[PDB]
Design a binder for this molecule. Sequence first.
Ligand SMILES: O=C(O)c1cc2cc(F)ccc2[nH]1
Ligand SMILES: O=C(O)c1cc2cc(F)ccc2[nH]1
Ligand SMILES: O=C(O)c1cc2cc(F)ccc2[nH]1
Ligand SMILES: O=C(O)c1cc2cc(F)ccc2[nH]1
Ligand SMILES: O=C(O)c1cc2cc(F)ccc2[nH]1
Ligand SMILES: O=C(O)c1cc2cc(F)ccc2[nH]1
Ligand SMILES: [Mg+2]
Ligand SMILES: [Mg+2]
Ligand SMILES: [Mg+2]
Ligand SMILES: [Mg+2]
Ligand SMILES: [Mg+2]
Ligand SMILES: [Mg+2]
Lengths: 155, 155, 157, 157, 157, 157
Amino acid sequence: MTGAVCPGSFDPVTLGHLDVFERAAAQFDEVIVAVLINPAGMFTVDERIEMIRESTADLPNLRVESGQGLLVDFVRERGLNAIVKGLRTGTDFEYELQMAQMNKHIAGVDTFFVATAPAYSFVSSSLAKEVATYGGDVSALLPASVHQRLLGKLR
Amino acid sequence: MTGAVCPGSFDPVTLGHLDVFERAAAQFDEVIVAVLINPAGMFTVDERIEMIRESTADLPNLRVESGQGLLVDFVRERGLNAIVKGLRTGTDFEYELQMAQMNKHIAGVDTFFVATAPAYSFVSSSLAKEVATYGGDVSALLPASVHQRLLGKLR
Amino acid sequence: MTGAVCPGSFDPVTLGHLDVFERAAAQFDEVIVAVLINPNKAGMFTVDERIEMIRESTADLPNLRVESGQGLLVDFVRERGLNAIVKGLRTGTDFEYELQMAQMNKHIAGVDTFFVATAPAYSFVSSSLAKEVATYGGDVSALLPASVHQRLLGKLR
Amino acid sequence: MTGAVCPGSFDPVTLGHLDVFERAAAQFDEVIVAVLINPNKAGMFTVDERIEMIRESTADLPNLRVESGQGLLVDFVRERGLNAIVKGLRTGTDFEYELQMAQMNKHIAGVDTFFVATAPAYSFVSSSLAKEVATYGGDVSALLPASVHQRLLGKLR
Amino acid sequence: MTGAVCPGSFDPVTLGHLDVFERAAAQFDEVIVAVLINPNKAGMFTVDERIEMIRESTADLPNLRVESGQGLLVDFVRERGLNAIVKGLRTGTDFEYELQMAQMNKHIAGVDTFFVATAPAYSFVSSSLAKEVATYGGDVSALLPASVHQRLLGKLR
Amino acid sequence: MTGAVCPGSFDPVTLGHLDVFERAAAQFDEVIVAVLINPNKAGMFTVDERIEMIRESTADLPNLRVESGQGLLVDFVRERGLNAIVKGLRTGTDFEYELQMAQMNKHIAGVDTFFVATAPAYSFVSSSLAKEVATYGGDVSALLPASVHQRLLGKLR
Ligand SMILES: O=C(O)c1cc2cc(F)ccc2[nH]1
Ligand SMILES: O=C(O)c1cc2cc(F)ccc2[nH]1
Ligand SMILES: O=C(O)c1cc2cc(F)ccc2[nH]1
Ligand SMILES: O=C(O)c1cc2cc(F)ccc2[nH]1
Ligand SMILES: O=C(O)c1cc2cc(F)ccc2[nH]1
Ligand SMILES: O=C(O)c1cc2cc(F)ccc2[nH]1
Ligand SMILES: [Mg+2]
Ligand SMILES: [Mg+2]
Ligand SMILES: [Mg+2]
Ligand SMILES: [Mg+2]
Ligand SMILES: [Mg+2]
Ligand SMILES: [Mg+2]
């Protein structure tokens, strides 16, 4: 009965996030995507959850839930003690390293990092929103569903 | 039926390696420690395997095997497609990132990185050997068994 | 024929920026310094002040011109018939964040980015740190062109 | 008579800070801990509370004293007859913004900066992360001096 | 007439190298690929084989030519009337040893270095890792030009 | 009372090293430059040559002395009644490798390590790169003390 939690804001979910979800779902029996409620973003929590659910329909062992507060409490309250996070740079590793060590210290929760697929090395929710705001084409970087929803928030 | 391979030379295995093994064994159903045969080291392959087996007796779902050649072939020939590796720095992440992306490309094998326990952040097989060679006390950094064997190779 | 764009907010321009401008001007037929203006947040200097400070310290570069813009950098570049950006870099961390933006710029518009290592003497000046040091009275006269230093002190007083 | 200044906001002081203070006091005749007063961002503890938490935690360091200050750090250092800063570091990224600042401080005032690696056990603690964890009920008592932990529980009630 | 030199051992040339060559040839009037001859470490391919592999892969770049050389790179560059080097980069660490070399080359000979980010798809390929993977039977054909892959299979037999 | 050890192979000493020596000598009562000799691999310069080059360029530092040693640095430090190492750092990568050794040194012997950022003008000189550039004829006269440069050229000829 293995399992891991994939946390983030996912505003919106990108193909880089989806790649991490698919890799986590292939290596753990149960994956929970943890969508942070952090009350300034573009999509509401419900919209973010729906976009992730739409993009993960081919992953039978993955579910999507929202939460607040300490990630380690979210993880432990579901009987798990592993986090799976995607990583792009060594700079990414250092700040995430501090949080991983803190999370292990306070709750015994482990963090596994997975390297980003090369094709999504430069994709982030924030950069995709910013580029699309000025009319740049990000359709190759986002799930097809997410892309239409993004066009709608801008127009 | 989840599983991961933890590769290295382990010459000798340190408490930093053991920490990674224990974390992998807690999150995957099956863990295989892959001891590289790379024919200049201090211990023979058989001695390295025995030291790891001695230090992992409390991990029922972990076994230790030797191998050569492409790590991805070792992994795939055992029905698995995940590697678990310990990481200390962002510099660690960058060279290991290149190998992880190559391994995914050529064999579909994924790599999960886990941050080192803070207490073992500075321990490496090479630095422990070098310090012990000049008489420094590394007993707090190595499994109790390994420590005696190391004293024997030097004296 | 060849050309590159050197972008930044240049609020104000530093000697590190000027070094980059001079290196780009020596290697490309034309260089455009693109002064980024945020229509929502004013900097310390207005657009005309930023441009004046750059022009005064680049008068010896005949193939360099200065223009302002906003929004997507790759549109500024392509509308001028060019497809190269030149940017200065001080460290490995600068390289990772700038890396993301360079790969996005090539993906969305085919525009290439060339990075050049700062001259050592200017490794540590940034517009933001020069402003913060000067705000609390530190001497930054050797890090800014003559066209900048006293205008900066006047803004602060 | 040698000496160094250890600057920070210390809101609150952590065991990582204390480890740096102890190592500085062991190697310099005089150490001054400089507590930054920022008239903008007012943190969780007042400057007086922060000074008292540091004094309790450093009671066994006779050559270390605690003072508050404002503005340019190198002015604080030189006003006390010193020309050295001692700061703790955790990562290579830490070394990057801090290296820019150290070179700037050497350039503008001739003040030197010595960096020391955090003890491994305290490498993941920071004032900000400790407060955030404690706000949501996590146990950070192994990462803070005993008296800080008591005061921090009070501020959260 | 602008120009730049693209140096390396290219043993063998990869698609990451080729991407850099194409971007340099698009932005400079003349590009010289400089193939290093090292009388000590003799790699897998002779210098002539390496030049021919590059020429096959760059047949559509008319302003790019391939030459071999030895010793100090900045002497090779200045002997050809140029003063710019173009190199591809992958990581922040890459930027570190390469930044030291670029500053040294600027200091000793006035030669500038422009760095370009690898295309994402080729960011994990290197000559050395490709050879190692191919030696043990891994498939690196998507990472090398077609003619390189054929020659590399031959050397392994 | 206070003191620090500045270790290295100094084969040969550079102006970056001398900058570190001067900064340590201004902040500690005594400084010992510890010249590391590998009894198994000779460097370019013998131990007496390395020491002579350092002494000639540190004659204005009355509280600095030069001694050779081998093996564990922490034994050299402790046998002299000291427990501080001072080392220069150029980049974030330098900080990670040196980090490992500083934490091991504190673990096995209680010896602290203080790092100081190189002066910008010497950010890019290393003994190894100066030797390699000089080997192929490049001009490194401005990166080495007078006590070194012509002795280096003589070794190479
Ligand atoms: O990044 C975090 O701190 C975080 C993300 C998150 C998601 C949840 F669903 C609950 C708590 C969280 N904390
Ligand atoms: O690091 C490697 O390349 C490697 C380690 C290893 C261990 C094995 F058992 C087999 C192949 C390997 N390759
Ligand atoms: O950094 C940018 O995104 C940017 C800089 C810039 C300068 C211009 F003139 C126009 C658009 C820009 N965008
Ligand atoms: O980091 C700073 O800018 C800073 C810290 C500090 C502390 C003092 F007590 C006085 C000035 C300061 N400046
Ligand atoms: O990297 C170098 O040192 C180097 C590469 C190279 C290529 C040439 F053709 C000539 C000299 C070189 N030096
Ligand atoms: O870098 C070292 O390990 C080292 C430097 C050194 C210098 C001495 F004089 C003695 C031992 C040393 N060890
Ligand atoms: Mg993102
Ligand atoms: Mg190791
Ligand atoms: Mg700037
Ligand atoms: Mg802190
Ligand atoms: Mg290569
Ligand atoms: Mg050196």
